[PDB]
Amino acid sequence: IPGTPVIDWADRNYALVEINYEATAYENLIKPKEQVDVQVSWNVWNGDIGDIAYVLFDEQQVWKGDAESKRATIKVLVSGQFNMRVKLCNEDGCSVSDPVLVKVADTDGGHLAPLEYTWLENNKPGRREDKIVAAYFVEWGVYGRNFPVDKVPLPNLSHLLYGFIPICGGDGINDALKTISGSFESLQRSCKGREDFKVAIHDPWAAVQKPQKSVSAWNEPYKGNFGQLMAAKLANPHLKILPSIGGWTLSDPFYFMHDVEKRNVFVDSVKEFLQVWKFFDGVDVDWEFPGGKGANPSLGDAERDAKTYILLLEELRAMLDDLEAQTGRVYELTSAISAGYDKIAVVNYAEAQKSLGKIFLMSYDFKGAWSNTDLGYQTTVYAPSWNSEELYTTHYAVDALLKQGVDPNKIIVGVAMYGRGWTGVTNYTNDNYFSGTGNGPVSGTWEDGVVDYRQIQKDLNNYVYTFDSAAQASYVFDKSKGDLISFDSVDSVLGKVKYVDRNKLGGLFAWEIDADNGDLLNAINAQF
Ligand SMILES: CC(=O)N[C@@H]1[C@@H](O)[C@H](O[C@@H]2O[C@H](CO)[C@@H](O)[C@H](O)[C@H]2NC(C)=O)[C@@H](CO)O[C@H]1O
Ligand SMILES: CC(=O)N[C@@H]1[C@@H](O)[C@H](O)[C@@H](CO)O[C@H]1O
Numbered sequence: 001i002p003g004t005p006v007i008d009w010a011d012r013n014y015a016l017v018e019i020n021y022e023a024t025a026y027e028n029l030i031k032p033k034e035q036v037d038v039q040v041s042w043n044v045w046n047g048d049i050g051d052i053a054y055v056l057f058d059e060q061q062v063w064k065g066d067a068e069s070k071r072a073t074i075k076v077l078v079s080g081q082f083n084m085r086v087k088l089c090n091e092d093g094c095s096v097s098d099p100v101l102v103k104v105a106d107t108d109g110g111h112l113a114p115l116e117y118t119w120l121e122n123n124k125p126g127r128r129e130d131k132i133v134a135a136y137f138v139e140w141g142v143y144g145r146n147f148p149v150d151k152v153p154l155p156n157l158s159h160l161l162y163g164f165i166p167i168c169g170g171d172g173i174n175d176a177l178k179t180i181s182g183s184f185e186s187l188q189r190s191c192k193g194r195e196d197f198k199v200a201i202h203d204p205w206a207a208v209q210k211p212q213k214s215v216s217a218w219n220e221p222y223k224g225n226f227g228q229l230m231a232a233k234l235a236n237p238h239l240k241i242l243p244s245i246g247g248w249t250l251s252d253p254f255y256f257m258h259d260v261e262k263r264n265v266f267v268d269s270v271k272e273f274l275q276v277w278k279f280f281d282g283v284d285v286d287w288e289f290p291g292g293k294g295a296n297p298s299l300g301d302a303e304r305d306a307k308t309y310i311l312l313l314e315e316l317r318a319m320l321d322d323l324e325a326q327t328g329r330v331y332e333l334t335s336a337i338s339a340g341y342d343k344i345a346v347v348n349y350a351e352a353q354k355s356l357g358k359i360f361l362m363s364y365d366f367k368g369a370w371s372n373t374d375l376g377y378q379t380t381v382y383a384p385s386w387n388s389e390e391l392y393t394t395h396y397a398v399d400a401l402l403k404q405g406v407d408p409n410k411i412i413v414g415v416a417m418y419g420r421g422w423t424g425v426t427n428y429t430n431d432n433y434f435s436g437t438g439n440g441p442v443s444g445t446w447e448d449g450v451v452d453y454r455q456i457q458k459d460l461n462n463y464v465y466t467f468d469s470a471a472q473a474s475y476v477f478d479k480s481k482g483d484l485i486s487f488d489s490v491d492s493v494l495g496k497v498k499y500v501d502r503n504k505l506g507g508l509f510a511w512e513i514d515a516d517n518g519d520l521l522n523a524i525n526a527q528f
């Protein structure tokens with residue numbers, strides 16, 4: 001028998017996608033790899049080197065070669081952990097080394113352990129499984145809001161939408177970003193040396209670099225929101241995770257995509273992004289909005305954008321089908337859309353739904369502190385009791401989509417987990433505050449004019465509360481400060497559940513998950 005082989009000490013943690021934990025540019029951040037090369041070297045003690053050498057992974061042969069070299073190199077394609085041994089043979093028989101643990105990491109989380117949700121606040125088990133129940137998780141919530149992925153009530157969600165994946169571009173291309181201090185500068189860093197119109201990550205620190213629960217080791221392959229999402233998917237195998245591209249301030253590049261050159265760069269970038277970040281199950285298109293009236297007033301062209309949107313969806317669906325065939329997986333394609341009828345009219349949704357599995361109707365932000373004059377329900381199902389002629393309602397938006405021929409199955413109704421409101425509202429009559437005028441935005445939790453649902457509850461005693469059962473909408477008022485806030489409550493949300501059930505819609509989705517204390521998400525999952 002040959003001498004006993006002993007494997008040399010080595011870093012044996014490998015990554016099919018390498019992360020530079022100091023990089024700020026997306027192109028330095030990741031190093032995607034075809035394969036990983038597992039390296040082993042050994043020495044032989046008390047006997048001969050053997051006539052032949054084998055490498056075993058969990059007692060399966062993965063290499064044979066020269067015993068005299070005392071070295072082997074083994075190609076590995078997929079993530080996982082396994083025991084590696086060296087086995088030396090001669091005519092007599094074999095001697096085997098002690099095993100070493102080898103770890104190959106990849107973005108499907110194959111090297112990870114499940115990250116389970118511990119039940120926080122008022123959240124309660126029970127998920128409505130015959131409907132779409134989705135929520136947006138915002139990338140930047142890991143800061144002030146202190147809401148990392150591990151606080152997300154994933155057992156009660158069918159879908160988690162990651163907001164937001166940006167499109168690369170500087171001056172002229174992401175000007176909307178300039179309305180938020182540092183936001184445009186931050187994106188420029190992330191896209192440094194990266195071609196315009198490619199997808200990237202806005203905050204690679206929050207996305208992958210920041211230590212978080214269960215991904216905080218010194219040599220952790222993937223940290224941040226992304227690392228947490230890989231692990232959380234293992235704990236919640238029902239869940240689908242979608243990268244959401246665009247949103248209010250990141251939508252500008254879409255307006256340039258009538259040009260097939262830029263559109264091609266974008267679609268290819270998306271394809272590469274999903275191959276790099278295996279934990280995503282598709283793509284959510286959140287263009288705000290075809291036709292304009294988004295964060296950037298200069299932008300928008302109705303006839304041109306309606307076609308761009310259709311073309312873009314078609315090409316994304318065709319790309320996603322290639323991925324499906326190539327990986328054996330099922331990839332979704334969705335879009336978040338305005339619930340304003342004047343924005344809905346821009347787009348042929350009967351044509352769009354030929355590429356889309358779901359449409360996230362953004363039935364909120366109907367009204368807000370951008371105007372002191374136009375006071376009303378920021379979200380609501382029907383027209384208010386005091387104004388039966390309101391068109392900015394969930395019912396009208398849904399009706400408009402139905403009239404266009406959209407399957408009601410594909411329509412997902414939006415729930416705001418925050419309120420929009422005004423301060424100092426006066427010059428009104430008969431305690432109808434909505435006939436008054438505001439003196440500015442209500443003081444806000446994180447931004448002014450907007451209040452987390454959780455903050456609203458904590459502050460309930462400061463307010464007189466009103467439900468409008470005709471409209472299925474709620475609000476609060478504090479004469480003391482003249483504070484008026486319209487928001488989704490347990491009542492109005494149950495209203496929306498009833499509305500969705502009655503009209504056979506696809507389900508509901510919330511914006512944004514960190515603002516809830518569990519009340520609203522429980523309500524969303526209520527089954528009648
Ligand atoms: C009906 C409507 O949306 N009116 C416009 C407002 O929406 C818009 O404010 C923005 O609404 C977005 C929701 O779709 C928010 O995410 C966005 O944050 C909010 N505004 C700001 C500054 O944050 C305003 C522009 O403020 O214009 C209205 O006409
Ligand atoms: C960065 C890193 O992973 N370092 C190594 C790891 O590879 C090795 O497997 C382990 C002992 O096996 O000791 C660690 O220090």
Ligand SMILES: CC(=O)N[C@@H]1[C@@H](O)[C@H](O)[C@@H](CO)O[C@H]1O
Nearest residue numbers: 108109233278279280327328329
């Ligand atoms: C990315 C992840 O965590 N899990 C996916 C899973 O969604 C999919 O069903 C499966 C099919 O191959 O591929 C896994 O990688």
Ligand SMILES: CC(=O)N[C@@H]1[C@@H](O)[C@H](O)[C@@H](CO)O[C@H]1O
Nearest residue numbers: 342366367371374376390391392
């Ligand atoms: C931002 C805004 O207030 N837009 C108004 C909306 O309030 C109104 O209900 C509807 C009337 O058609 O559309 C717009 O004129």
Ligand SMILES: [Cl-]
Nearest residue numbers: 023024025028
């Ligand atoms: Cl860098």
Ligand SMILES: [Cl-]
Nearest residue numbers: 014035036037
């Ligand atoms: Cl390697």
